[PDB]
């Protein structure tokens, strides 16, 4: 029920001149927006990406970002000159802005900034501040960014007002797409493990949504505690892939099944016998 909205930005600076900035947006585990360096405008990846904003409201908002992207590039370039020769290219900056949605009219907006893959700066209250672990040289950049009263007021409005308003629209507009149910398909296989006389049975599960799923190897009605399931790997069509592995002895795969429960199945659990 608690959906998290994320606006991920990735900025690469190779030298003084060359730089590119790319962005994506996620509502839960669904991409809502894309914005390539090539493109001058933000691309919708869903039909409901505009949400409950009018066309005029979106244009004002898009232009705001269009200005930011140009200004961000130059600011960073100038901040490097300011610190130099303390820090130098190549540089990779990452932003992770967004707002978690809680039931009622409750939310928590955030704007996290990372420098060379290390979370260093955030926007908190009405100003930029560093976090524990951040170098001390960042203090001058922070001092400069906090001097810009206009940027502060704009970001405050963006986090406090715009983010929760906008996302509340998305959840309504893309309700059916968020609450969609897709059935997993399963199939079995085996490979030799590190051990000499040991097999490793694998239970594949693919094409299910949402992410929550239950997969276990079973002997009759006895849970095999050896079962080790891997990571949730994505599919192209916005569904999930998962495999569960169980280490066994060779010639001891008789009466071993893989049970799979999922919300979309609705009672009728999948069972595949070896």
């Amino acid at each position: 029920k608690n959906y998290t909205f994320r606006c991920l930005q990735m900025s690469s600076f190779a030298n003084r001149s060359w730089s590119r900035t790319d962005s994506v947006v996620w509502l839960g585990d669904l991409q809502t927006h894309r914005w390539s360096n090539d493109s001058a405008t933000i691309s919708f990846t869903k039909p409901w990406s505009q949400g409950k904003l009018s066309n005029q409201q979106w244009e004002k908002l898009q232009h705001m970002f269009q200005v930011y992207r140009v200004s961000f590039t130059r600011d960073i370039q100038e901040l490097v000159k300011m610190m130099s020769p303390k820090e130098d290219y190549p540089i990779e900056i990452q932003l992770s802005a967004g707002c978690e949605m809680y039931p009622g009219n409750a939310s928590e907006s955030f704007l996290h900034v990372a420098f060379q893959g290390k979370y260093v700066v955030r926007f908190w209250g009405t100003s930029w501040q560093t976090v524990p672990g951040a170098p001390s040289w960042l203090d001058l950049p922070i001092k400069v960014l906090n001097a810009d009263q206009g940027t502060s007021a704009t970001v405050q409005m963006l986090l406090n007002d715009t983010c929760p308003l906008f996302v509340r629209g998305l959840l309504e507009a893309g309700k059916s797409d968020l609450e969609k149910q897709e059935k997993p398909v399963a199939w079995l296989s085996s490979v030799p493990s590190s051990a000499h006389g040991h097999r490793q049975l694998v239970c594949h599960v693919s094409g299910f949504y949402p992410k929550p799923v239950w997969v276990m190897w079973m002997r009759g009605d006895q849970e095999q505690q050896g079962t080790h399931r891997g990571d949730f790997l994505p599919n192209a069509d916005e569904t999930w892939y998962l495999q569960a592995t169980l280490d066994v002895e060779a010639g001891e795969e008789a009466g071993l099944a893989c049970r799979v429960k999922h919300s979309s199945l609705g009672g009728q659990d999948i069972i595949l016998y070896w």
Epitope: V67, A147, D148
Partner: T-cell receptor, first 112, second 114 residues
Framework: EAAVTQSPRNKVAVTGGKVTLSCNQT?????MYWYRQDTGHGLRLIHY???????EKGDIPDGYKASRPSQENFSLILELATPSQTSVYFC??????????FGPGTRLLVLE | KTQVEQSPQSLVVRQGENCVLQ??????????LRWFKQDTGKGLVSLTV?????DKTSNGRYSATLDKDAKHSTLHITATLLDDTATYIC?????????????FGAGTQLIVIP
């Protein structure tokens, strides 16, 4: 309160000669700037500095070399003076804020 | 060609009369706008600075306005005196910090007949 001083205030030079425009500032401002004014144009940035040791290229840096030996001084050096550099040169300073406090100006005439 | 254009280029007014100076720009973004006053062979005396979307300012006889939507700014001078004889420069800063660059106009040569 935040005053900035330039020297020389008025200068005559010949083509090929060295000209050194200086700019002292006792405000402890990290950032200092160099502009030139020409009738028909606005003030255009030549060089600027973010601190002692640092010098950066402006809009029209060609023909000029900058030098920031300390927080206070920031010099614009014309290594090989030319008639095209006949102008009024303004120096400025400022902290992290947008405000740039300008100096009184420096007239330069480069004769043949 | 330039990002800041002023109008008129020059004008002549008799002492006691009013005059309005224009300033249009294409600078983006536009944090603030400042009006300078440059007497013959002198420095840059700041008159006022405008920051808001629809800002209004005053400095005795001097007063100015700014519309960021139109990217337009005026400088009204009530009861021109002899000392107003100067060049009036329009400046636009694209940031609210030292990161910003200042975009200068050519100016407006005012001549007050005593």
């Amino acid at each position: 309160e935040a005053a900035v001083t330039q020297s020389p205030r008025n200068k005559v030079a010949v083509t090929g000669g060295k000209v050194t425009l200086s700019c002292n500032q006792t405000n402890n401002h990290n950032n200092m700037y160099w502009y030139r004014q020409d009738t028909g144009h606005g003030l255009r940035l030549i060089h600027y500095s973010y601190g002692a040791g640092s010098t950066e290229k402006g809009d029209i840096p060609d023909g000029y070399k900058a030098s920031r030996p300390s927080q206070e001084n920031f010099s614009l050096i014309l290594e090989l003076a030319t008639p095209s550099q006949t102008s009024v040169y303004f120096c400025a300073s400022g902290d992290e804020g947008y405000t740039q406090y300008f100096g009184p100006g420096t007239r330069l005439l480069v004769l043949e | 060609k330039t990002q800041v254009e002023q109008s008129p280029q020059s004008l002549v007014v008799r002492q006691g009369e009013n005059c309005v100076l224009q300033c249009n720009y294409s600078v983006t973004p536009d944090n603030h706008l400042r009006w300078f006053k440059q007497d013959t062979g002198k420095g840059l005396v700041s008159l006022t600075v405008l920051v808001d979307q629809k800002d209004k300012t005053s400095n005795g006889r001097y007063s100015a306005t700014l519309d960021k939507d139109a990217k337009h700014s005026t400088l009204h001078i009530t009861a021109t005196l002899l000392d107003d004889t100067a060049t009036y420069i329009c400046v636009v800063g694209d940031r609210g910090s030292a990161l910003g660059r200042l975009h200068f106009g050519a100016g407006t040569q005012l001549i007050v007949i005593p």
